[PDB]
Each structure stands twice: as structure tokens, then as C-alpha cells.
Short mmCIF file of C-alpha atoms in Angstrom, two decimals:
data_model
loop_
_atom_site.label_atom_id
_atom_site.label_comp_id
_atom_site.label_asym_id
_atom_site.label_seq_id
_atom_site.Cartn_x
_atom_site.Cartn_y
_atom_site.Cartn_z
CA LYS A 17 13.11 -1.35 18.71
CA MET A 18 16.65 -0.19 17.41
CA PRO A 19 15.85 1.65 14.21
CA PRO A 20 14.88 4.99 15.77
CA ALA A 21 11.43 5.19 13.82
CA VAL A 22 10.82 1.59 14.83
CA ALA A 23 11.58 2.49 18.39
CA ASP A 24 9.12 5.30 18.10
CA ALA A 25 6.39 2.95 16.50
CA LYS A 26 7.14 0.69 19.59
CA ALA A 27 7.13 3.28 22.19
CA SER A 28 3.55 4.43 20.70
CA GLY A 29 2.19 1.00 21.21
CA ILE A 30 2.18 -0.39 17.48
CA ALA A 31 2.47 -3.91 19.03
CA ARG A 32 -1.19 -3.81 20.28
CA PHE A 33 -2.55 -4.18 16.98
CA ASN A 34 -3.59 -7.71 16.77
CA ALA A 35 -1.71 -8.58 13.45
CA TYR A 36 1.58 -6.97 14.58
CA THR A 37 4.38 -9.41 15.19
CA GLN A 38 7.59 -7.93 16.09
CA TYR A 39 10.73 -6.32 14.89
CA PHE A 40 13.17 -8.51 13.00
CA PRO A 41 16.74 -7.37 12.72
CA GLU A 42 17.60 -9.94 9.79
CA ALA A 43 15.60 -11.12 6.70
CA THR A 44 12.40 -12.79 7.65
CA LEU A 45 9.92 -14.98 5.74
CA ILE A 46 6.29 -14.42 6.64
CA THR A 47 3.92 -17.29 6.16
CA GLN A 48 0.96 -16.98 8.46
CA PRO A 49 -2.48 -15.65 7.69
CA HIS A 50 -2.20 -12.32 8.39
CA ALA A 51 0.81 -10.31 9.89
CA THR A 52 2.52 -6.80 10.34
CA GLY A 53 5.81 -5.98 11.54
CA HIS A 54 9.11 -4.27 10.86
CA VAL A 55 12.20 -5.79 9.16
CA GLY A 56 15.09 -3.49 9.60
CA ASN A 57 13.54 0.11 9.12
CA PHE A 58 10.70 -1.30 6.83
CA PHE A 59 7.14 -1.75 7.96
CA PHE A 60 5.07 -4.73 6.31
CA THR A 61 1.62 -5.72 5.87
CA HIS A 62 1.09 -9.30 4.88
CA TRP A 63 -2.66 -10.61 4.29
CA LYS A 64 -4.04 -14.04 2.74
CA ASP A 65 -7.40 -15.70 2.89
CA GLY A 66 -5.40 -18.94 2.26
CA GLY A 67 -3.09 -21.05 0.72
CA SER A 68 1.00 -20.79 0.74
CA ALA A 69 1.36 -17.36 -0.16
CA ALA A 70 4.36 -15.82 1.63
CA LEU A 71 6.69 -12.49 1.87
CA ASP A 72 10.38 -12.94 2.14
CA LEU A 73 11.79 -9.37 3.29
CA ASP A 74 14.95 -8.31 4.30
CA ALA A 75 16.33 -5.46 6.11
CA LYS A 76 17.53 -3.81 2.99
CA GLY A 77 14.08 -3.62 1.62
CA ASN A 78 14.41 -6.56 -0.70
CA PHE A 79 11.48 -8.68 -0.85
CA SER A 80 9.84 -11.61 -2.73
CA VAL A 81 6.12 -12.60 -2.86
CA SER A 82 4.88 -15.82 -3.97
CA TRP A 83 1.32 -16.86 -4.05
CA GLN A 84 -0.50 -20.05 -4.78
CA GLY A 85 -3.33 -20.85 -7.38
CA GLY A 86 -6.62 -22.18 -6.21
CA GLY A 87 -8.15 -18.41 -5.99
CA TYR A 88 -6.72 -17.37 -2.93
CA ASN A 89 -6.40 -13.58 -2.66
CA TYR A 90 -3.31 -11.87 -1.12
CA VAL A 91 -2.14 -8.34 -0.34
CA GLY A 92 1.21 -7.62 1.12
CA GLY A 93 4.40 -5.70 0.88
CA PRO A 94 6.99 -3.54 2.45
CA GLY A 95 7.21 0.24 3.44
CA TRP A 96 6.30 2.34 6.09
CA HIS A 97 4.13 2.62 9.11
CA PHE A 98 2.89 5.97 8.15
CA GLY A 99 2.15 8.33 5.32
CA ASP A 100 3.90 11.22 4.49
CA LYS A 101 2.67 13.63 1.71
CA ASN A 102 6.08 14.75 0.93
CA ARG A 103 7.67 11.31 0.54
CA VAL A 104 9.15 9.96 -2.63
CA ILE A 105 9.21 6.17 -2.95
CA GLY A 106 11.71 4.21 -5.07
CA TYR A 107 11.35 0.80 -6.22
CA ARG A 108 12.10 -1.83 -8.78
CA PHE A 109 10.29 -5.27 -9.78
CA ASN A 110 12.88 -7.75 -11.16
CA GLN A 111 10.04 -10.33 -11.86
CA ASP A 112 6.12 -10.27 -11.66
CA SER A 113 4.30 -13.55 -13.04
CA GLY A 114 1.25 -11.62 -13.35
CA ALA A 115 -0.16 -10.05 -10.04
CA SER A 116 -3.39 -8.55 -10.13
CA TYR A 117 -1.81 -5.45 -9.50
CA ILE A 118 1.33 -3.85 -8.06
CA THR A 119 0.96 -0.46 -6.48
CA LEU A 120 1.72 1.96 -3.64
CA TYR A 121 -0.86 1.22 -1.27
CA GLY A 122 -1.73 3.06 2.02
CA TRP A 123 -4.57 4.39 4.56
CA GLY A 124 -5.80 7.91 6.01
CA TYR A 125 -8.15 7.94 8.63
CA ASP A 126 -9.43 10.69 10.85
CA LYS A 127 -11.21 9.88 13.84
CA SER A 128 -12.38 13.46 14.35
CA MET A 129 -14.46 13.34 11.27
CA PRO A 130 -18.21 11.66 11.40
CA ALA A 131 -17.81 8.22 10.38
CA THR A 132 -21.02 8.74 8.19
CA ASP A 133 -18.75 10.95 5.82
CA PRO A 134 -16.73 8.29 3.57
CA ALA A 135 -14.08 10.74 3.51
CA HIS A 136 -13.09 9.96 7.05
CA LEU A 137 -11.10 6.98 5.91
CA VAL A 138 -9.52 6.60 2.90
CA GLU A 139 -7.75 3.69 1.00
CA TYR A 140 -5.36 4.93 -1.50
CA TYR A 141 -3.47 3.35 -4.53
CA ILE A 142 -0.92 4.49 -6.74
CA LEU A 143 -1.03 1.82 -9.46
CA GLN A 144 2.22 0.61 -11.23
CA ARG A 145 1.27 -2.58 -13.01
CA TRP A 146 -1.85 -4.60 -13.58
CA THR A 147 -3.51 -7.64 -15.00
CA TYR A 148 -7.07 -6.65 -13.15
CA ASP A 149 -8.00 -2.85 -12.91
CA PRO A 150 -9.17 -2.44 -9.57
CA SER A 151 -10.35 1.10 -10.24
CA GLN A 152 -12.97 -0.15 -12.56
CA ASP A 153 -15.72 0.71 -9.87
CA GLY A 154 -14.42 4.30 -9.52
CA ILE A 155 -15.32 7.68 -10.85
CA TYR A 156 -12.75 9.63 -12.91
CA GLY A 157 -11.00 12.79 -11.61
CA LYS A 158 -8.66 14.44 -13.77
CA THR A 159 -5.43 13.33 -15.83
CA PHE A 160 -1.93 14.83 -15.07
CA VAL A 161 1.61 14.23 -15.41
CA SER A 162 4.33 12.88 -12.70
CA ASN A 163 7.85 12.08 -13.26
CA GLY A 164 7.14 12.24 -16.84
CA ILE A 165 4.39 9.79 -16.77
CA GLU A 166 0.52 10.57 -17.42
CA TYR A 167 -1.71 9.34 -14.51
CA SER A 168 -5.49 9.62 -14.16
CA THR A 169 -7.12 9.82 -10.81
CA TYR A 170 -10.26 7.77 -9.70
CA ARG A 171 -12.33 7.50 -6.79
CA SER A 172 -14.51 4.59 -5.47
CA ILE A 173 -16.90 4.02 -2.72
CA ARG A 174 -16.78 0.85 -0.43
CA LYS A 175 -20.06 0.37 1.32
CA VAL A 176 -19.98 -1.84 4.66
CA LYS A 177 -16.51 -3.34 3.68
CA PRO A 178 -13.55 -4.61 5.61
CA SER A 179 -10.87 -1.94 6.59
CA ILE A 180 -8.41 -1.12 8.95
CA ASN A 181 -11.05 0.33 11.17
CA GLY A 182 -13.23 -2.46 10.84
CA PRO A 183 -16.37 -3.11 8.52
CA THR A 184 -17.29 0.51 7.60
CA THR A 185 -18.16 2.70 4.49
CA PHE A 186 -15.17 4.55 2.95
CA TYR A 187 -13.63 6.10 -0.19
CA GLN A 188 -10.76 4.71 -2.17
CA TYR A 189 -8.50 6.87 -4.10
CA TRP A 190 -6.74 5.67 -7.31
CA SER A 191 -4.16 7.16 -9.85
CA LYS A 192 -3.43 4.73 -12.68
CA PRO A 193 -0.54 5.56 -15.35
CA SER A 194 -0.94 5.34 -19.07
CA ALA A 195 1.22 2.32 -19.45
CA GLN A 196 2.91 -0.48 -17.40
CA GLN A 197 5.82 0.21 -15.47
CA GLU A 198 8.54 -1.92 -16.80
CA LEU A 199 10.33 -4.89 -15.09
CA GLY A 200 13.94 -4.39 -14.50
CA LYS A 201 14.14 -0.69 -13.75
CA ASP A 202 14.15 1.69 -11.16
CA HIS A 203 11.02 3.70 -10.65
CA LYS A 204 9.99 6.88 -8.60
CA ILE A 205 6.52 7.57 -6.99
CA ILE A 206 6.57 11.44 -6.32
CA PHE A 207 3.58 10.88 -3.58
CA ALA A 208 3.14 14.63 -3.24
CA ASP A 209 2.09 14.91 -6.85
CA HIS A 210 -0.66 12.41 -6.65
CA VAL A 211 -2.08 13.90 -3.32
CA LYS A 212 -2.24 17.37 -5.21
CA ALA A 213 -4.14 15.52 -8.29
CA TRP A 214 -6.83 14.03 -5.72
CA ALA A 215 -6.82 17.42 -3.96
CA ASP A 216 -7.53 19.35 -7.23
CA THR A 217 -10.86 17.51 -7.67
CA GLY A 218 -11.48 17.99 -3.75
CA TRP A 219 -10.60 14.43 -2.77
CA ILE A 220 -8.82 15.08 0.20
CA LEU A 221 -6.58 12.46 2.15
CA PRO A 222 -7.58 12.14 5.85
CA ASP A 223 -4.99 11.89 8.54
CA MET A 224 -1.74 9.40 7.61
CA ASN A 225 0.07 9.34 10.79
CA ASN A 226 -1.69 7.73 13.67
CA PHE A 227 -2.73 4.76 15.09
CA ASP A 228 -6.32 5.18 15.73
CA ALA A 229 -7.88 2.74 13.62
CA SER A 230 -9.16 -0.56 14.85
CA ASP A 231 -6.44 -2.96 13.39
CA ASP A 232 -3.65 -0.99 11.65
CA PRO A 233 -1.69 2.05 11.61
CA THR A 234 -2.11 4.16 8.70
CA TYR A 235 0.63 2.74 6.71
CA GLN A 236 1.88 3.26 3.28
CA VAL A 237 3.65 0.18 1.33
CA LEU A 238 4.49 -1.13 -1.90
CA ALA A 239 2.08 -3.88 -2.35
CA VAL A 240 1.58 -6.98 -4.58
CA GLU A 241 -2.10 -7.76 -4.82
CA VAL A 242 -3.77 -10.93 -6.17
CA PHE A 243 -7.19 -11.71 -6.46
CA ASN A 244 -8.73 -15.20 -7.60
CA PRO A 245 -5.39 -16.54 -9.34
CA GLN A 246 -5.94 -19.39 -11.17
CA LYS A 247 -2.14 -20.32 -11.39
CA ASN A 248 0.68 -19.66 -8.90
CA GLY A 249 3.01 -16.81 -9.12
CA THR A 250 5.95 -14.71 -7.87
CA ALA A 251 6.70 -11.22 -7.99
CA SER A 252 10.11 -9.82 -6.39
CA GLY A 253 11.69 -6.52 -5.95
CA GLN A 254 13.00 -3.78 -3.64
CA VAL A 255 11.66 -0.62 -2.23
CA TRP A 256 13.45 2.27 -0.71
CA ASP A 257 13.16 5.90 0.28
CA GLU A 258 14.05 8.75 -2.56
CA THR A 259 13.04 11.61 -0.35
CA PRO A 260 15.45 14.28 -0.64
CA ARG A 261 17.01 16.07 2.26
#
């Protein structure tokens, strides 16, 4: 549409994805079961299997996520419709009732690779806050420091499970810090450090800039994830681009 990267995504056909809604020039409240779209220059993904969970997002990247009790799962947040190995992501959370985890969240997908190789499709996470450890099914890779924070890497396998390319078998890459990242303070994710840490143990990311998958672009967002919540909650903050010239 009007922001140049949104124009490009539109011209490349992002709207053919079933979940894609539209470009919103002003703040938008997303309440339907599953939606992607753009608010300003910010891509978003939003998905719940039920309940009132909602994403309120403006064109400055400010956002708030609410979720309902009753066990309904939620994953959603704002960012970019493509991943960039050299992106530096800035964010803060001012409030977090206790989401299952808060994380950079994205996908790579290489249609030229055999689908029987789980490395053809990767769901990746840079965890920042958590009350549930989603890497608990993963194998340990290595420990390293990025932006003065110690992280450890993990890789898990998902067998015939949902994905941006439909039900299939694929790898998840994780990076988990030694401490919860504090509320009320700006943080920075130097994505290239985590890409390198994964490559150091031979865990390579497939293509992060394509619309080849069935259901979604190979997006990269700052996501609030909530699984089987016993109480309602909210998490609010902001995301932005810290990548230097």
C-alpha cells in the first residue's frame, strides 16, 4: 500500500494468503480467530483457538495483547513480513501478567529442499520472558553472549504438526537467555548473533524472504504466546527497528 515495503508485499501478492486482511493506516484492534496484515509499516500475525484474545496495534509499533482464561491458546504480535539475518530488533514490555512466553518469532522455508529434510522449514524463537519453557523438548546446542546477555541454543523436531506450510515435519530453533528480560526497559535483539550461534552447531536457517509457503510469509515478529492459560492476562509494549545504517 503506502509504506514502501507494504507496497512491495502487496505487489508480490501477500493478500492471497487466506489469513491476510489488509493494510491499516491507523491503529487497529484485531479480534477475529486468525489474521495477518499490516498496521502502518508493521506486519502482524494473530491467532487464537478461541476466547476473546485480541491484539491492539498502531502504526508506531505500540501494541497490547489481552487473553482470556479457559485454556485458549494465543500467538501474536507485530514486526516484519520477512526475516533479515542482519536485523537488530528493539522492543520493550511495560506490562506482562504472565504470558507463557514472549519471544522473537519467525520462519524460514526453502521450497527447493526436500520436504523430507526437516531443515527445509524452521520455526525460530529468541525467548525473552517465559513462565513455560517451550524449549523443553529440544536438544542443547551451545552457550554464547549477545548484547551482554548469555544465551543457550536448542533445536526441537515437530512431526506432522501445523506450520506456515501446512501439516509437515520441521525443526524449531531456540535461543534462551540466562535471565528474564525486565519489564519497563528497552531491550535489543542482535539477530545475527543468534543466527551465527545456530550455524556454529550446523543449524542453518532456510530462506527467510519468500511467500512460497502455503499459509504465511516467512515473517519475523515480536510475539506474545499463551498456552492453556488458567486466568486472563495482558501484555503490552512496543517493537521497532534498531538496525544501523
